[PDB]
Amino acid sequence: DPTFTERGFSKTVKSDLIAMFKRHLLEHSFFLDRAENMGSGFSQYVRSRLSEMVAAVSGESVLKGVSTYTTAKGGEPVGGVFIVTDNVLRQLLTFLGEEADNQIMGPSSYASFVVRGENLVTAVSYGRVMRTFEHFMARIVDSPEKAGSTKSDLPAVAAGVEDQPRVPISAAVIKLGNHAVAVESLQKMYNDTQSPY
Amino acid sequence: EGVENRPFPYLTVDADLLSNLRQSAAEGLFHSFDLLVGKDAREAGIKFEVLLGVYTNAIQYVRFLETALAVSCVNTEFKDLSRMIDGKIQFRISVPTIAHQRTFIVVKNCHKHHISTEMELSMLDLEILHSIPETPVEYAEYVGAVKTVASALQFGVDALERGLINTVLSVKLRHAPPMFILQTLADPTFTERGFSKTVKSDLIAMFKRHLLEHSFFLDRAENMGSGFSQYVRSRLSEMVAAVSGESVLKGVSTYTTAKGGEPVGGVFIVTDNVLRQLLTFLGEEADNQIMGPSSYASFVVRGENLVTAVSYGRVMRTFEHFMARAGSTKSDLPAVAAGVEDQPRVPISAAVIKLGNHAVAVESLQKMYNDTQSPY
Amino acid sequence: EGVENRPFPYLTVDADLLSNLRQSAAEGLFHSFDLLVGKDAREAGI
Amino acid sequence: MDLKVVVSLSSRLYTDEIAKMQQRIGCILPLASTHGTQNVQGLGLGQVYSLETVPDYVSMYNYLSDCTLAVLDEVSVDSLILTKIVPGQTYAIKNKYQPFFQWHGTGSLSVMPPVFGREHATVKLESNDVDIVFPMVLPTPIAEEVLQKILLFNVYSRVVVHMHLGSVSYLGHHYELALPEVPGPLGLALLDNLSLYFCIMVTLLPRASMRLVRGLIRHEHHDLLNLFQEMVPDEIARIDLDDLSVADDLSRMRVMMTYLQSLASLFNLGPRLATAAYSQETLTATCWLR
Amino acid sequence: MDLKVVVSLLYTDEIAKMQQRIGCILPLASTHGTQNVQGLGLGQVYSVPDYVSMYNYLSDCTLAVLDEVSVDSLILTKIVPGQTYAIKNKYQPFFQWHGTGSLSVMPPVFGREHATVKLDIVFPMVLPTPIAEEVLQKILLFNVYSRVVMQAPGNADMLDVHMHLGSVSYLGHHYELALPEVPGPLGLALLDNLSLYFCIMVTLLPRASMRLVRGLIRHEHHDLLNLFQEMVPDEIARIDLDDLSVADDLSRMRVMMTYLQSLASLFNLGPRLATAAYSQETLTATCWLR
Amino acid sequence: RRRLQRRIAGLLPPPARRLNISRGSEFTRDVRGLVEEHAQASSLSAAAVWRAGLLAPGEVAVAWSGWRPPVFGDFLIHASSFNNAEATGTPLFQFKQSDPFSGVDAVFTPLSLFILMNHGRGLTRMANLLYDSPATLADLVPDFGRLVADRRFHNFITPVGPLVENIKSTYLNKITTVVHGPVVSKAIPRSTVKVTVPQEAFVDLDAWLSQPCPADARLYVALTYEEAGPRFTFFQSSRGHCQIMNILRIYYSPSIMHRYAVVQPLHIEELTFGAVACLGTFSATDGWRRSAFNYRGSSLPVVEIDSFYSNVSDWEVIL
Amino acid sequence: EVHHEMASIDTGLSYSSTMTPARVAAITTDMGIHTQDFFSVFPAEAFGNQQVNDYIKAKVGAQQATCEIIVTPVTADVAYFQKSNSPRGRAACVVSCENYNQEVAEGLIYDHSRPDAAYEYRSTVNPWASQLGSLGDIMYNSSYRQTAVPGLYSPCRAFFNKEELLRNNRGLYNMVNEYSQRLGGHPATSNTEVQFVVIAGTDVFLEQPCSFLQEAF
Amino acid sequence: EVHHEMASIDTGLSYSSTMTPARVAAITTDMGIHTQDFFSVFPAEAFGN
């Protein structure tokens, strides 16, 4: 929330943020149990707090231009993913009414970023390899004056992740306003292995 | 001791340089050398540091008409504001009489605003900018220097544009009385006497009444159960009716709702979290596009004006309409819109809500202000 | 620090990275960073 | 180079202040910053010389020397254009100072805190509810005369003659100047440094010259001597008993001439202006910052 | 900008005499294009000799190196504080210059006939600053010591003030001087008034210092130093009068402050010219105005 | 008389003060002609020299601008009296030798000038690391102790400002220093130069006091006489010289009575408590960024006054 | 430097813009009790003796929300403190006296021959903060606050000063838009350790209905 | 002021360059007798009287 972190972190705002930390610990933590004694308005409370957890994440990935992992039925990008224990997952699915989807598209195999040949030369000689060497050549010794912008270089930030086959992936999807987060509980993975989730 | 061993492609030159070496390298004939015997006599393993790409933010220009704040302010590109010391507007308002005449000639004055930041440039990237390269390392230096200077110039005009939005927000906040005064003063049941003493005392009582009952409505929007949506609509609608729309530029078509011929008639400026809350209490919005002007209007000084401007000032807005001078509303209407008409009507992405017959647009500026590390 | 200041073809993405930035760097969220004000904001020489 | 600073007024301006300020065009004004646009606060000496009854002239000198200098030429409503003064540039400075000081040919100007009353060089800007005072500019000999008259009033406060000290005299006109009673610890600090210099002078003052001046007043009489009223001072009697020796006289002068440069440079407070080619028909001069 | 000044007027020996000094400087009258003979250096002031008026005249007008001498003109460039120049040590009192030494211009105390050209043109002396202040002291003490032995023969001796005054010393350079051994009393000599100022200020320094300490010590403590340095003077200058007519005391104080400031501005040598890299093989030096 | 029109055409145009730009990404030729300041160093071709325009009178123009050309004083010093690992941006001090015909001067950087003070009685660790023997510096001044003893050391040393280029010769080192002007290097990549002064020798005078901010805050040097050996401190301030003498007297107020208590002033020349000199001005906003200075072993803290404008003055005595 | 000028001009006759407070993000003042010392307000003033003066000055501890003290008798009923009123024991209303004059405004705000504006039956509640020479003006009015440090934010100064009492009694539209467009009611600071008062305009952003209404909660 | 840079680097590991003295031309100091004096080398030291 930028409205407290706007001033510049003097003494008299951190001594306020510590009291705000304590007030959010005393009241708003452990929010699944405040919904069971809520009575009737539990779905609104849980759907508020999940969206509040989402929007308070500065999710500015530099790879946010990569159109990976969209939802299957609609076509919206899946921005963000939840991880829960399996005991709370059914209560989350019943409290949030029903899923809007049962599968999401995504990359089928890992993108291959390999050492190319000019990369191999600078690998042997100095030992320092960049990501996209031919792209650096195109931006330096071919057209350096070309002012590259967001529509111009969006293939270069997506190292092959964008053209690879999109298979479905079975995962529960919920909808929080315009953002569509997909929930998953991998507790089945651990309980057959006797390690603590 | 000052020498690596990576498996270089070693050129196999056939000099007799092998001879008389170890007695020489025992004395340190060379200044930097590292003897490798045994298991160190190997082309070493390839080790490298991976540079996973460089990244930056393309600073987008936030054009002054690309934000919906310019529905609050129509504008005319005036190419010579340096030579305008003063601008006034005369209002002749005629008050009719009612059986059981008056004229309000009010004067309004303009006030100028100066804004200025300071970009900065080193003397290196001007002298290497004027000079010409011939080797491609100098060409690579030159394109970097012209990128820096172009970045500084585009930064300068972009900072000036953000300053224009800042000045607009400041001048709108300066002519902004609070809610708890214009909630009552707009209600004409208390200007009906004529502002004598005791009705003024009841007005300052009603200020205190509205302060502890109607201020901070959005905090009372959480404890009212499921009665929050109608409460928010009922507060913002009477805020809409609390402001005088009696303006002489209301006759022209500045901004439309981009889906009908509905005028938008207002703008809400909120923060980020207030916007994220309001678009959830007011449900689905109406639209996500607003038709508005693509460019500023233009008002130059032609020669029939320019003769007065060089003689003794007093340059009129519309000398042609003055030199043609009955009058009606629709005859005087195009002289009011002095260039705001026939703009090619480029849409503007901004959220619009609906309060009865007004389709008010509501937008947040934090995406602009909090990229400058300045408090909203 | 470990920051290299050599010029680069800085790829431009559209994500607004700078949400509460200068307060973060004056608090030192980043491991290692360089504040360049004014004259040093150019591409350094090769 | 472009040196234009426009100062934005936070409110409007009434017509009487417009008429008053357009008379005050070409005078030297101080500024808070050196940036592009500034507001009405920080302009003028009125922030440190407030609407009060006890002045402080040396802190005004400090505020003048610390900040930059400018000249006001174009003034209108809501806005008035200033032109900065930076070392390396030349300017034209007009003579619009109402105590009408006739300027010498090619002398040197000096800025000055307003000694001729607060109300003399002041525009009341009640529209922005603040006050702008105009710092006086007058030539360097009159500057040193005013300054030493100020310090002599500050040191003869504790003794008593008043009209013969707190009123300057010029070829053009004699003037009166406003006198406080205490300049605070900064004026006392100026007197501190002055007495420091002075007591080390009278430690290291040469004794050949006293032996000259005793026989010189008893032999000759001049305008440079008639202030003694043909009477030898008592320390001339109790000092010239000693013999006259060359070596310690040279060793005294070799430090005396070092100290007097510092004693001159301590009176360099306030920015100085070495101008050139003043004309008595245009009332302006080609000036630059020294 | 444009820097040349063409002045209008010679014959072959005049051509050779002016050609001898084509690297020296002299002041002008104005910064215009064409001028006359009378507007050239030190002509209208030095022909009774008096030092303080000539130093005031040298700080008054600007300065100029000369470049070429024709039959009827002298091509010369005035110096501006912007850019740098190249001048020469072509003066008959030869003071050897050094690297990064500040050069001064004093009016000629070394006699008319050395630094002149008989047509008139009088060139000022150029010489470095420690030599300048030391020759100032060693001409001033020579003046007062000559006046004393003209008054009283038993106070000093003539050879007593030539073992220590006829020679200046700077980095091993042990030069001599042309001291005027017959000044003549009642003024009428060069530097006759500067000694007459120095004696009056050294006479009024006790009346100043004691009055200042007694007036500053009542303001109890801004600083301890005004009473801390009460022990370093002798007690003879301490107990002098503590009582006089404050009209007379104030007049004496005002005259001593004015003469002190004028003398301290004169002991600062005037237009200080700064060198960068002197070359004795070429007798030239990079120089610019400061 | 029509040729005078062409002459006034060749003489008229000033540097561009205003420019009504429209957009930033266009990069018009007119705004380039505003921002293009001519260079000083170019490759050696007559067309390349003509585009660089170095043959123009006084200031550079392709066939005035508020900018000053710098001067470059040259010095010669013995190779042991200087360390070639000195920084580029460091101020220097000339000591005038006593021979009448000299040729070879004697320059002291403050690191070297420190060991003229310490020997005879961190920072001193580095000053003994670089200049290892004081005996190689104790002789460039012939009579140091007598000259301190009569307190005429300050009028023998004139500051020459910062260093630029050190051609590392074998025996007689030739250095170039800027006595006056914009301090900028003579290199083929013309890199910026920042004047450095060691941190322990340099106390701020602004934050020592702990609204009027000008642009040019000056840098002052100060030699002071202590009975524990004289010291060279440096001072940053945004005040006038009238203010600098008073606030320096108040700053040195303990040391004056320290010297008064330990050594009584028996003669008349000990009373001079050192002097000051303006070394010049710089930018008051971006001033005095800290940095580090490595020799092969150690690291002293050091300030970096960046983009300095050198201007020496004489000595004004502190008292 | 990039310069830009623009000249706006108001077109609607009445008010064309409203500011409404909506939410309370953080009560930043750390609202407790910490009264400031008068000995930093008046460091010069002292009693006759020195040692008893230093004894008291050491006993109270005279060396982040600032309270002040108005002295009142014990006979004030709690009903005056129950309703939100003016803290000086007198209903300091701004409009039941006439506008653009000084006689009847000073009569309603300081004279006690007319009763209180709120209650029908009493002149005041306390006579130590409502008289023309009370304790409240001798603490906080600017006419007797000379040789006091500016830059302290004594909060009770806004409930007493005469300049605000004349500034509010202009025309009501003039009062409200000069309240909005100029934020100078000599207010507090924003984020400092102790509350200073602000000097430079359009830098920090604060308004107060306290100087608009002269009441308190 | 012109400038020119050259960058040498030795591409032979051993000595690649030698220098003899070939012939004498003149012995420009005479192998004579003029001894130095310590009164100029050490002028500071002196005797009792």
Residue numbers in the entry:
A (entry chain x): 199 to 395
B (entry chain W): 5 to 104, 113 to 337, 345 to 395
C (entry chain S): 5 to 50
D (entry chain f): 1 to 160, 172 to 301
E (entry chain g): 1 to 9, 13 to 50, 54 to 125, 131 to 301
F (entry chain e): 9 to 71, 82 to 139, 150 to 238, 256 to 364
G (entry chain W): 1087 to 1149, 1179 to 1332
H (entry chain T): 1087 to 1135
Give verbatim excerpts from the published study on this entry:
Epstein-Bar virus (EBV), a member of the subfamily gammaherpesviruses that also includes the Kaposi Sarcoma-associated herpesvirus (KSHV),2,3 is the first identified oncovirus. Similar to other members of the family herpesviridae, EBV has a characteristic three-layer configuration: the outer lipid bilayer envelope containing viral glycoproteins responsible for host recognizing and membrane fusion, the inner pseudo-icosahedral nucleocapsid enclosing a 172-kb double-strand DNA (dsDNA) genome and the middle pleomorphic tegument compartment fulfilled with 20–40 different viral proteins. All herpesvirus capsid shell consists of 4 abundant proteins: the major capsid proteins (MCP) constituting the basic capsid skeleton through forming 150 hexons and 11 pentons, the small capsid proteins (SCP) binding to the tops of hexon MCPs or both hexon and penton MCPs, and the Tri1 and Tri2 forming the heterotrimeric triplexes to plug the large holes on the capsid floor. Once the viral dsDNA genome enters the procapsid shell through the portal that is located at a unique 5-fold vertex of the icosahedral capsid, the viral nucleocapsid is joined by the capsid-associated tegument complexes (CATCs).
By symmetry relaxation and localized classification, we sequentially resolved the structures of the C5 portal vertex, the C12 portal, the C1 portal vertex and the asymmetric capsid at resolutions of 4.2 Å, 4.8 Å, 5.5 Å and 7.5 Å, respectively, which enable us to build atomic models for the portal protein BBRF1 and the CATC proteins of BVRF1, BPLF1 and BGLF. Similar to that in KSHV,22 we also observed a turret-like density located between the C12 clip domain and the portal cap. Based on the agreement between the turret structure that is rich in helix-like densities and the secondary structure prediction of BBRF1, we tentatively assigned the turret to the unmodeled region of BBRF1’s clip domain. By docking the atomic models of the periportal capsid proteins and dodecameric portal into the C1 reconstruction of the portal vertex, we identified two portal regions involved in interactions with capsid proteins. The first one is the clip turret, which interacts with the trunk domains of five sets of Ta tri1 molecules. The second region is the portal wing, which interacts with capsid floor elements, including five sets of the spine helix in the P6 Johnson-fold, the β-barrel in the P1 Johnson-fold and the N-anchor of the periportal Ta. The C1 reconstruction of our portal vertex revealed CATC densities are as strong as those of the surrounding capsid proteins, indicating full occupancy of the five CATC registers surrounding the portal. The helix domains of the BVRF1 molecules and the two BPLF1 C-terminal regions form a helix bundle lying on the BGLF1 molecule. Each CATC binds both triplexes Ta and Tc.
